[PDB]
Design a protein around this ligand. Structure first.
Ligand SMILES: CCn1c(=O)[nH]c(=O)c2c1nc(Cc1nc3ccccc3[nH]1)n2Cc1ccccc1
Ligand SMILES: CCn1c(=O)[nH]c(=O)c2c1nc(Cc1nc3ccccc3[nH]1)n2Cc1ccccc1
Ligand SMILES: CCn1c(=O)[nH]c(=O)c2c1nc(Cc1nc3ccccc3[nH]1)n2Cc1ccccc1
Ligand SMILES: CCn1c(=O)[nH]c(=O)c2c1nc(Cc1nc3ccccc3[nH]1)n2Cc1ccccc1
Ligand SMILES: [Fe+3]
Ligand SMILES: [Fe+3]
Ligand SMILES: [Fe+3]
Ligand SMILES: [Fe+3]
Lengths: 341, 329, 329, 341
């Protein structure tokens, strides 16, 4: 096959995790911490911890500094005020659970290891510390395994409200709460699976889709508009605007991928899904249209990718689907058996 | 309302540690050899030590034990090409390649466990002692196999009084690597969850007659783990049908010598049918993502299963499109 | 490449008219009674006349024939509560209510046919004579049952030389009204399509042992159509297992007296399994909307089946939502 | 149940067919045939033929007059010119088949009985002559059984190009060709099934949806815009405009039902579906949202409606779905068996 390589077992994903195109140690010219050498040590320290991680090892716990904690607290405190009225219902349900089990409070910074075990029990997702920016191919590859790569560093203390870069605050307050949702999780994994062995152009179609959904997504819950995009949750200024008076469009994959992603500017438009079950099924049809010589089936038992290119593997799937339907019948039998319905 | 069973993988630790019997009778050679008894408590102590999320420990290489292991390893091998099912013979060379299965070495459960998880999703955990049939089968529901870390006494390699590492590694593990056998075992586990004790024993008899001692066939081969472990019975078994309702009834004989399965897909669906007859207020669906048990007692839980099955069918459609797309077929 | 079989309901007329035997032997009382022979050719002539899309004709009410019918109708009735499966007893009173099934009347196939189409989708068409097992089973694939319009001679009501209206109406029809029995019969039909002759006969033996003469059971009852027709054998049958592969082998005895089916859902899936063993280059899917046969030999045809099955599952989901919505369950 | 009555067997549909709210005999004040008493006899004649039809009878053949035939010919001739370039691909494939089997030519007018047997073999649909306008409830009820009610009369000969009323030309050239499509057929039946036992407001939501899809629908085939709506096919003036320079919107049920249907005026907007399989699945999700105490399953064997309100009927469906999946496996087995794939 002439197709692009993609990890076919969970252990192979480490290759993706470590292909860092730009390390966190590398600060851009206009960055606030660019002349702060105390800050740089921390960035280098976090990069090193991430580089040391390999599959099968517990996610390392790190002790945050006091100013970092205050920085986290400031972000945590300000965003909390806007969540009751700007966050989606899925976000609201999960967030208190995080306070109880992951130490999600103003004076404490959660550990990825805590969050990972929390996520694995509730939605099957896990987190990995990432040393820096990855190729969209390698990043989305992680999603196929329900693995989210997280930055472990804190934004510069100079201005807590603003960040030009993803940080642990963005990871913890923006992404994690909604990753816990089983339906949101399936939706995320669909984007990942779609990328596997796809062309670069298709990958970046998916990357754009991810950007306007996971990063900046709005969903209508109970007849009202709420935000579920992680970027929106992290940014107070943008979050206000997203749900404010004045441009929203329905989430359609084919239409959405065309748009351009802006880092500095408030986004041109914000897309909407009635539900994550809708987004997952609008993704799984889009995934069919993606060009590749095979389809992919995810085996959660062996944590590997099955390639569906012959009738043998396909029937095997169908046979499985038959047995599972038999279990559905059992449940319906028992339900009639015990409730007379 | 119903007998408690673990609903998360982490809750399974409760099952592993409920050991009815840890303790050797007069017949066993253990009291006779004081040195042997000292080691056994250590292996028992380690099993008690084990907690979920902890890598399986690696034992000290003792050549006397290691020498004993070698005898069993070599002797059983001559028999396998002649008496074992293809699935065994597929997996055994791989065990030699990756889990350091060799005559002079004893495999460490951590190696074996990581091997199984990649191939069929099974993992093994060391068990302190004999478990209730309820708790043992509960592990199977999670594709967790409990193993005995300790090795039999050196006095007689051929004869074994109780299950040992040689039995678990040479009898069970090669078959636990087969995805369909794995699905078959889990069905027995799942069926037991929240069942009446008697239903559980019925299942234990089924398990005994298939997983521990069992045959499949256009030739006849042995797939029973106890058969793989025992040289004499294995010959007898091939020397001069599987229906669960009928099979559960027959008695289990510990010392005296005592079914045919076409394939494991058969044994998995003739098991899943048996599950319906089992008395409980719910059906069970296993969630491999969260490694937990879903209880199907309402329409809400049932629908999400069905919806999931819908999506999986769309993937089947995608595969068929692409197949036509590239081969015109 | 494979033996031709009708792929549309309209093509089935070719099958109906391929009559090997229309013609009475010396043993039959027909030559002896010249009057009886005159009527029979007329019924044979009408069957030949029948074309698809034409309402079944209604015969002249002849009291001699009608009187003969009455004897069979009343005599068999005493036996049925004692010897017939519940499905028969469900349908028979309805036949009395809607198809003018009474002691003094002979039902007209058009009435019977319209009754069956509402309840199980089956229809009946008059057949001129004995058909090839291939063509007869082809009708079953379309849920079309071929019937003999003519009635047995008045000399002896109890004894029947060849199938007649009494046999078709009192033996077959009450069971053709049951949706699951209907699905079961169609499976036999579908399996035969494009099969080798020998596979076809194997199926004919299966059909003979189930549809014509067959029993189901926590009590034992007769569901065979020939059994319902014959007073003596019916008693014998209940007096002092169904596996298709095993069952096809046993010989069919015309004069001498010669399986148990739990339910028809069983007999339908133990039939559909037998279909896989049958040798052909395709599988068959029946399209009830266009009343035609789909041939599954490519991914295109297979996918559309799967997609359809996806939509049907969404309906299942809708039902479950509403069920929770209204009952909180 | 307090729910509105709907036919539960195919024979019960006759009640729906004969509830005519306005007969064809009744001509409106501005109608072109309003003072033509030769025309009125024909309208009354067609109404009478329709009233005489009952289930199980062959659809009566009628002999058309010469001026009617010329009128049909004129419509047939002019519309043929715009089909190669305005019609959808599904329309184009079917139309020649109609010429060969249903006598679809300029000098002949097709008989409903011919068309019905044609449709029944290819997509399971049948036609019924209808005496006049039906309630949207009763009309859609027919679709649930894949039965389309057709007018059998010809528009006034005064002006063949224009008609304020549905006529046999509209039925034959607008509706029938696309009804033959198996996928379009399933789509139509979904609208029908959805209406069964629904509220009046829901019914007219569906009626609006039907209007903007079946009557005035545009579909994108092979990257180009084509018309599949029956109204568009019948009307040359509108058909030109529908695909012309200048307003099109994507077909969404929830959005579409809100719009108003105009008889005289060119429609405000025209909706689009990528395919009929898309429209069917966008309908079947909309059908879930429709309020009723049950779901409906269509039994094509007995031509009746199953009510799914308990676990017994639902399992029975699931069991059926299991067996059909077994057949899928057989096909895949045989395919590997014979082709090694
Ligand atoms: C699909 C796009 N995309 C990609 O192609 N590759 C990524 O590595 C990536 C990513 N997206 C995010 C996470 C992320 N969150 C954001 C919030 C606001 C703006 C950009 C963001 N990127 N990452 C992780 C990341 C990003 C920058 C620095 C460290 C880690
Ligand atoms: C279903 C019966 N059954 C049970 O109810 N509970 C168990 O704990 C169990 C078991 N079966 C086996 C393992 C096993 N392998 C055997 C081989 C031959 C004979 C008996 C065997 N039991 N075990 C594990 C075990 C058994 C004895 C001592 C330590 C561990
Ligand atoms: C599968 C065997 N088989 C076949 O191969 N071809 C048939 O045409 C056929 C048939 N079986 C039956 C009907 C039938 N009912 C019976 C009852 C008792 C004994 C034999 C019977 N055949 N028929 C119909 C028939 C039989 C004889 C005279 C006229 C019509
Ligand atoms: C769902 C709307 N709708 C309804 O509620 N009831 C209907 O009876 C109906 C209908 N729609 C059509 C058929 C039809 N084709 C049209 C083309 C252009 C304008 C109106 C049209 N109605 N009919 C059939 C009909 C319409 C008018 C006169 C005779 C027969
Ligand atoms: Fe992000
Ligand atoms: Fe064992
Ligand atoms: Fe018969
Ligand atoms: Fe119309």
């Amino acid at each position: 096959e002439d197709v692009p390589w993609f990890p076919r077992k969970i252990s192979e994903l480490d290759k993706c995790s470590h292909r860092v195109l730009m390390y966190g140690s590398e600060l851009d010219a206009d960055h606030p911490g660019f002349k702060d050498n105390v800050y740089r040590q921390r960035r280098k320290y976090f990069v090193d911890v991430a580089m040391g991680y390999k599959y099968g090892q517990p996610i390392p716990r790190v002790e945050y500094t006091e100013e970092e904690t205050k920085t986290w607290g400031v972000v945590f405190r300000e965003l909390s005020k806007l969540y009751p009225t700007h966050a989606c219902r899925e976000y609201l349900k999960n967030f208190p659970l995080l306070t109880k089990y992951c130490g999600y409070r103003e004076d404490n910074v959660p550990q990825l290891e805590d969050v990972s075990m929390f996520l694995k029990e509730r939605s099957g997702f896990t987190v990995r510390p990432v040393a820096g920016y990855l190729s969209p191919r390698d990043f989305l590859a992680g999603l196929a395994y329900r693995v989210f790569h997280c930055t472990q560093y804190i934004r510069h203390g100079s201005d807590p409200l603003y960040t030009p870069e993803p940080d642990t605050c963005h990871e913890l307050l923006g992404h994690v709460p909604l990753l816990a949702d089983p339906k949101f999780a399936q939706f995320s994994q669909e984007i990942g699976l779609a990328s596997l062995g796809a062309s670069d152009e298709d990958v970046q179609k998916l990357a754009t889709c991810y950007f306007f959904t996971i990063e900046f997504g709005l969903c209508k819950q109970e007849g009202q508009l709420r935000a579920y995009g992680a970027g929106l949750l992290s940014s107070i200024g943008e979050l206000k605007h997203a749900l404010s008076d004045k441009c929203v469009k329905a989430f359609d994959p084919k239409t959405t991928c065309l748009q351009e992603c802006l880092i500095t500017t408030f986004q041109e438009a914000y897309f909407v899904s009635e539900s994550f079950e809708e987004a997952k099924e609008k993704m799984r049809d889009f995934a069919k249209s993606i060009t590749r010589p095979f389809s992919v089936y995810f085996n959660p038992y062996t944590q590997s990718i099955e390639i569906l290119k012959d009738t043998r593997s396909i029937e095997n799937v169908v046979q499985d689907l038959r047995s599972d339907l038999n279990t559905v019948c059992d449940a319906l039998n028992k339900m009639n058996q015990y409730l007379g319905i």
